[PDB]
Amino acid sequence: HAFKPGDLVFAKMKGYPHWPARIDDIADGAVKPPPNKYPIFFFGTHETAFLGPKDLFPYDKSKDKYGKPNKRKGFNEGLWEIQNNPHASYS
C-alpha cells in the first residue's frame, strides 16, 4: 500500500504528539509537495503540511498506541473528527 488521498494516519511533527490526520489531494493551483512528501491535513487544528512516510503511521495499525486523549489544544477535537467523520470537508 502506497499512501493515497483519503488514507487516515497519525502524523508526527517535532514538538507535537502523534496527531490524527489524513492524506489530502492537491487542490488545482496549489503548491505541490517536495519529492516523496504528501499533503497532510491535521484533524482538530485543520492545518495542512507536507510530510514524508517516516512521519506517517497508518490509522488502523496505530490507533491503539496513539489514539488516546491528551490536553494539547485541538487534539481531542481531532480524535473526535477522525473517529466520527474523517472524510468531511473541514472548509
Residue 1 domain-assigned (yes or no) = no
Here the CATH number for the domain that contains residue 80 is 2.30.30.140
Are 49 and 40 a contacting pair, CB within 8 Å?
yes
Domain that holds residue 30: 8-84
Q: Which helix (H) or strand (E) holds 57?
A: strand 56-58
> Which three cell numbers, joined as nine digits, stand for 72?
494539547
Q: Which of 31, 32, 23 is nearest to 4 (CA)?
A: 23
**DSSP secondary structure, 1-43, as one string:** ----TT-EEEE--TTS--EEEEEPPPPTTSPPPPTT-EEEEET
Data resolution in angstroms: 1.6
The span from the CA of 21 to the CA of 63, in Å, is 11
Residue 91 domain-assigned (yes or no) = no
Residue 90 domain-assigned (yes or no) = no
Q: How many domains does the chain have?
A: 1
